[PDB]
Ligand binder design. Structure first.
Ligand SMILES: [Cl-]
Ligand SMILES: [Fe+2]
Ligand code: NA
Length: 453
């Protein structure tokens, strides 16, 4: 196991004005890339069980006409602050309990009410200063919407300038609460509540021009088990393929229920993109056969010799006939893909051609390449390097771009032989390297980041 180091704690927090650049970073790139992920996998004697459980650390890559500055700090959440001060796991994580719920926002980052927030799947995000990476505190919403579980994968409507998400109220009468947030406010407007007996773990969802599509994988929890059973969060979820996958379509303007459509059981973390065509909706999902991937991302497996027990996922385009009939799918690529990203700003909710992600196909190593899938003419473009393990490829469109794949791809890459990470920058069109920035230490394998102008 050569990628061992990527699942090891990073104690060191620093703020360096310059990183050693090899190449040329386009002048027009003058924004900030914020990477989020786990960077502390134990608290003294107690070890975190799952990859998702590790305490949040933010990594900042700010650009100034060729130069690139770097800073990293642990998110000073109550989860972290309690661990640091008591040397005891204090809050309930995704798959680890101590001996109310966690603010360990280690999944993603966005802006809400023009404030930078780190997110996880618990109700309240954590506000941080993009300048200092200091933690402001818990970001309270100004509304009466109830929730126990939500996503760190909100959508953004650029036309209406709305953040769109859902939150599950987990009670003896549970609801999927689909909501929106207008710019310069922290008030959530309830679009619609879908009642549900046994809520499903939906890490993300699909948004089209008119609709929000909740794809309800049959990986479900009994609310009372979550409340009473003395077992970590994810251990209370059960795979029930008899139920099949339910596509719940909600009009994201008037909150009307368009319809529910069923397919054969499957699981997914990440949606890629969705769009409407004539009397049909197309939902592109990074799908697994079942929920076994969840139990594969425990650290003792990820750190272990047996790599080939981690299930692979593929881009499946599900076609929903609004007219009627069961939902069917086809594969857009034979390549194994995870952590998918697109030209989000321009082509989200719309018909598109290009997907970027990590490739997990195990041709030589596990998670050892970045891939660019061409949906139109099939085929793909690959990036890799000896004993290098790249992170989520973040697309950034070029100024006044006429094409979908005109811009840059930013990826945090772990060099195992060097025992240190570097920020890879690829031309989105050719998918070949233009520059890279050297980081003094290793950046643990994170989840999601975003580029802010
Ligand atoms: Cl229950
Ligand atoms: Fe995710
Ligand atoms: Na090979």
């Amino acid at each position: 196991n050569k990628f061992q180091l990527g699942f090891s704690t990073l104690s060191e927090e620093l703020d360096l004005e310059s990183l050693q650049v090899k190449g040329t970073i386009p002048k027009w790139l003058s924004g900030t890339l914020i990477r989020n992920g786990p960077a502390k996998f134990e608290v003294g004697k107690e070890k975190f069980q799952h990859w998702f459980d590790g305490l949040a650390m933010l990594h900042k890559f700010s650009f100034k006409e060729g130069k690139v500055s770097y800073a990293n700090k642990f998110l000073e959440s109550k989860a972290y602050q309690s661990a640091r001060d008591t040397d005891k796991i204090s809050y309930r994580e995704f798959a680890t309990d101590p001996c109310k719920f966690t603010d360990n926002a280690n999944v993603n980052v966005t802006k809400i009410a023009e404030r930078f927030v780190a997110m996880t799947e618990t109700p309240l995000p954590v506000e941080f200063d993009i300048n200092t990476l200091k933690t402001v505190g818990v970001f309270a919403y100004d509304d009466k919407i109830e929730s126990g579980l939500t996503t760190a994968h909100p959508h953004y409507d650029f036309v209406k300038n709305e953040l769109v998400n859902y939150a599950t109220k987990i009670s003896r009468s549970s609801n999927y609460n689909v909501y929106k947030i207008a710019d310069k406010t922290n008030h959530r407007n309830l679009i619609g509540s879908i009642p549900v007996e046994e809520p499903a773990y939906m890490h993300s969802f699909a948004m089209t021009e008119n609709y929000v599509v909740l794809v309800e994988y049959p990986f479900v929890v009994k609310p009372l088990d979550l409340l009473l059973s003395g077992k970590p969060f994810i251990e209370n979820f059960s795979w029930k393929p008899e139920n099949g996958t339910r596509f719940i379509i909600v009009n994201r303007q008037n909150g009307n229920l368009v319809g529910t459509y069923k397919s054969d059981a499957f699981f997914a973390f990440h949606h890629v993109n969705a769009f409407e065509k004539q009397e049909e909706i197309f939902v592109d999902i990074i799908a697994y056969q079942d929920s076994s991937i969840v139990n594969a991302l425990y650290l003792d497996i990820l750190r272990g010799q047996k790599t080939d027990t981690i299930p692979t996922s593929h881009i499946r385009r599900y076609r929903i006939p609004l007219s009627g009939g069961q939902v069917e799918y086809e594969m857009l690529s034979s390549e194994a893909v995870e952590l998918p990203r697109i030209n989000y700003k321009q082509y989200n909710t719309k018909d598109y051609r290009f997907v970027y992600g990590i490739s997990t196909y195990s041709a030589s190593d596990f998670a050892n390449q970045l891939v660019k899938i061409d949906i139109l003419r099939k085929s793909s473009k690959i990036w890799s390097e000896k004993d290098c393990y790249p992170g989520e490829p973040v697309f950034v469109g070029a100024p006044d771009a006429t094409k979908e794949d005109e811009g840059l791809i930013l990826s945090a890459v772990l060099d195992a032989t060097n025992a240190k990470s570097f920020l890879l920058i690829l031309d989105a069109t050719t998918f070949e390297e233009v520059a890279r920035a050297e980081v003094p230490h290793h950046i643990p394998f994170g989840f999601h980041g975003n580029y802010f102008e």
